[PDB]
Design a binder for this molecule. Structure first.
Ligand SMILES: *[C@@H]1O[C@H](CO[C@@H]2O[C@@H](C)[C@@H](O)[C@@H](O)[C@@H]2O)[C@@H](O[C@@H]2O[C@H](CO)[C@@H](O)[C@H](O)[C@H]2NC(C)=O)[C@H](O)[C@H]1NC(C)=O
Ligand SMILES: *[C@@H]1O[C@H](CO[C@@H]2O[C@@H](C)[C@@H](O)[C@@H](O)[C@@H]2O)[C@@H](O[C@@H]2O[C@H](CO)[C@@H](O)[C@H](O)[C@H]2NC(C)=O)[C@H](O)[C@H]1NC(C)=O
Lengths: 535, 530
């Protein structure tokens, strides 16, 4: 046996695996159970801690992907398949992964903890693009990632009831974070230097742990990539959560609408997991893009108020946070329902298609609100140019769901004590399989942050390898010090503030400082549109 | 004696005067009566035609200015005084003026008819800046200008009442245009080629005659400079007109519509003027107490409604703006503004000024204005805030009403020519930060720089000659352009082309503040309805 691959955590003994990386070996403990399997009677319930075990658990491969809808819009297309499960689906899914240097560090090492995205309906820590080995080998950090329940299994809510209280997927995340505090030192990690980071719903998840006191003592720094807890898609209210839960139950025969909550969830627990998934999308109130059926619910518990309110009302002194977006946040989403869009043509839509897409991309708002959107995103010297319309609907979707929620969070946290750093990621990967008109689409910075270009199996350019190493250094510098800058003759990355609103561009060129995260657009979404909706 | 200065019109004989210009003499007939003096029992009533007279009416000098408030904000300042009355005030003021080439033309000459601005509360045909002598000598037109009642005397309305029906100042204009039809041939003018032109309220007046069938047969082409009938300041509704007339009566000691007007008629004219501004519902700029009322008669609908619903085939119209439509108005009520400093206001002053420049709108509508006119990378920069509030007032009151008029008329059959006037006069007395302010193209259209007595540059004289040529070309043909050699394209709802007018050659550009005017003309109405 190899003593470097054996570790004892509070629950018992573990055996890991040694991983080859271009720069040297790494130890990986993959598929560590951290909760009792949420099966049968435990479906929809908060996670229970894993009961201790005798003997040695083999933590030598990724465990199952949590039950979730699988994308089939472009079968066999790498651009969609890379986000799909690469392990069997199972409700027996609450495992986490730890990567550490080989040999194990001898002084406590800072810990990065990854929370994946996937719209709160999909995702997995086992995906090739979240491989932790390159980060750990390049920056000598400990990396942890966990699986958490998605879809109805993670976020179906009948608020008030003990049988389906909602938000158990976030409680899965919190339980893993408690696992890190109790156990990460056994791998050489420092429980007093834990940086959360995540993308899309993962980033909103990070933000929700910032705004929930019980999670706030489990980490020290945060990174929000292309997502924010105040996104119009990231939370739902109690009533609409109940309506969605109740319509899902109805669509699958429960009860034999509404009634006793206990009886209804009991009937839901008898349905095969895949049956729930097959009806997941049918509970949404209108045709939309960037909307997901089961998301965190604001019920006073995990979130005492809406994320907008807690952000505006919070003292964030002592917090360092790193936030950003990619260059074309909205493009990806348009091919999932906006009329006239396809990955397989230029998607040069008409004015009528643009106006129709406004209602898909900004669903469930008043006609007047839709008109305010058309006013701000129409160029009235070129109201019908197809190219300009394409990029405008992209900007509508990107600004409303990602950029302006990120901007609001960044500016409010900065003005209330937090040290904030902001980026716009502008490199389009040479390997990208989505069409040229989508630009740098949502999610396509991740592979660079994790250093996937260092994988010799893959076909990135040498400059992209240089660039991934640069980004890994920034992220790790932020995790160890709260500050991405290098402890010289390198251009500096200034804090983001509500007034100067400075951020840096991340691409193959050196850091370039710019001002304003779509400030004119985001004044519309963050300052004016809320007033319009209240009157 | 000089026979070229004696003319007989339908009402009797006139003696005019010969005037000098640097290009030669001109014949002028000034102070021709075209209505019975609207005095005593005739105050607030529609004009009656002038009864015939025996003998020779002396038409050698400007007649009295219609009663009106006089600006006292900068006593002795040329920038305000040039707009103040330059003859005594009288309710006996319904005279018009004719300028003709010398000797009088003997074949029909095209006619320009000037309607002065002044917010419908001030103005006069006798102002130095409206002297017709240069246009007539240089471009061989006949030029007519009329006085029309303003303030309460022209536009106080108790809608429904026979005693104060409203719009009588507009009927003053119509009667003058009828006078032109019957009599202008006696001066060499062609009644079949009559071009209306006006500025500010004068342009709104022109547009109202476009939209009222009884006037539409009295002229053939139209020029609207820095004004439009659909301006939020140019019309008032029946109920608010009644409220303002009633509150004026209260403020001057007067109590039934008949009894109320009878008591108003006993008050000295100057007393009415003294309370005029006090009937406005809030502190404001670019708002005026007594303006045309929409009551179904002169205007069967709102000017915005009539514009969208009209077949305008066969109409040529020339409309435009100056570069800084809003600047002048800010010093009459926007917090932090003065002509005597840089007016580098604070964000708090900007926000307060928005409610002054956009009065009587919901808090949400004001917030929408703040969103659109704030640069959110520089939300508190004084210089940008000054320029933005000028843009708010200028866009809301002039540019975007003009843009709507032009786009709708073009899209419904009219040939439209649009300009932006971008030259700041070397003679301008207003501060540099005001730019090219409201009204300061007029002196160039009238050729005032040709006056040797004044201190314009040689290039400015050439420029005035260019502009007189454009305006006169339009009056003769419906098209300002000269035979080809850079050309001035029609304005269309899509291409939205216009030209800049300044010391450089014509430059074609696109869009009359299209981004801002989409807000005021397309979005804000929907917001106000909900
Ligand atoms: C661009 O594509 C969209 C989507 O259509 C798909 O992709 C095309 C490349 C082609 O393979 C189609 O058959 C695919 O279905 C086109 O919009 C579609 O038009 C068809 C009929 O014309 C209609 O039935 C679909 O509902 C449309 N899809 C929408 C509106 O999302 C679009 O016209 C294409 N642009 C072109 C060809 O210029
Ligand atoms: C620019 O001037 C305005 C107007 O003030 C008037 O004109 C000035 C030239 C000076 O003579 C002032 O004293 C005049 O009252 C200034 O705004 C005024 O500020 C005073 C306080 O001193 C206040 O009482 C008035 O109400 C203000 N007037 C208005 C119209 O808001 C403004 O502060 C000056 N800007 C500067 C100096 O930068």
């Amino acid at each position: 046996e190899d003593a470097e691959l054996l570790v004892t955590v509070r629950g018992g003994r573990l055996r890991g695996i040694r991983l080859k990386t271009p720069g040297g070996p790494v130890s990986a403990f993959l598929g560590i159970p951290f909760a009792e399997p949420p099966m049968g009677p435990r479906r929809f319930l908060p996670p229970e801690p894993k009961q201790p075990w005798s003997g040695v658990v083999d933590a030598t491969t990724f465990q199952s992907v949590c039950y979730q809808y699988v994308d089939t819009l472009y079968p066999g297309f790498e651009g969609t398949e890379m986000w799909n499960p690469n392990r069997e689906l199972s409700e027996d899914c609450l495992y986490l992964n730890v990567w550490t240097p080989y040999p194990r560090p001898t002084s406590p090492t800072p810990v990065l903890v990854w929370i994946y995205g996937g719209g709160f309906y999909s995702g997995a820590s086992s995906l090739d693009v979240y491989d932790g080995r390159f980060l750990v080998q390049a920056e000598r950090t400990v990396l942890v990632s966990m699986n958490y329940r998605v879809g109805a299994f993670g976020f179906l809510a009948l608020p008030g009831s003990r049988e389906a209280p909602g938000n158990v997927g976030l409680l899965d995340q919190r339980l893993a974070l408690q696992w890190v505090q109790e156990n990460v030192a056994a791998f050489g990690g420092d429980p007093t230097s834990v940086t959360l980071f995540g993308e899309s719903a993962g980033a909103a998840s990070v933000g929700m742990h910032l705004l929930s006191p019980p999670s706030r003592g489990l980490f020290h720094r945060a990174v929000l990539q292309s997502g924010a807890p105040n996104g119009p898609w990231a939370t739902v209210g109690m009533g609409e959560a109940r309506r969605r839960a109740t319509q899902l139950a109805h669509l699958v025969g429960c009860p034999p609408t509404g009634g006793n909550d206990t009886e209804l969830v009991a009937c839901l627990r008898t349905r095969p997991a895949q049956v729930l998934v097959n009806h997941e999308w049918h509970v949404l109130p209108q045709e939309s893009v960037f909307r997901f059926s089961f998301v965190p619910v604001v019920d006073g518990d995990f979130l005492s108020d809406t994320p907008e309110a807690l952000i505006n009302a919070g003292d964030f002194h002592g917090l360092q946070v790193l936030v950003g977006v990619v260059k074309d946040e909205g493009s990806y989403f348009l091919v999932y329902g906006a009329p006239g869009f396809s990955k397989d043509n230029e998607s040069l839509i008409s004015r009528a298609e643009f106006l129709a897409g406004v209602r898909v991309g900004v669903p469930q708002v008043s006609d007047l609100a839709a008109e305010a959107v058309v006013l701000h995103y129409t160029d009235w010297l070129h109201p019908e140019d197809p190219a300009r319309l394409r990029e405008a609907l992209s900007d509508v979707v990107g600004d409303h769901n990602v950029v302006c929620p990120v901007a609001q969070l960044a500016g409010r946290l900065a003005a209330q004590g937090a040290r904030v750093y902001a980026y716009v990621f502008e490199h389009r990967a040479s390997t990208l399989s989505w069409p040229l008109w989508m630009g740098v689409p949502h999610g396509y910075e991740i592979e660079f942050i994790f250093g996937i270009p260092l994988d010799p199996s893959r076909n990135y350019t040498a400059e992209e390898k240089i660039f991934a190493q640069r980004l890994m250094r920034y992220w790790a510098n932020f995790a160890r010090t709260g500050d991405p800058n290098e402890p010289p003759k390198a251009p500096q990355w200034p804090p983001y503030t509500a007034g100067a609103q400075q951020y840096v561009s991340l691409d193959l060129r050196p850091l370039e400082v710019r001002r304003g995260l779509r400030a004119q657009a985001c004044a519309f979404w963050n300052r004016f549109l809320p007033k319009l909706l209240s009157a």
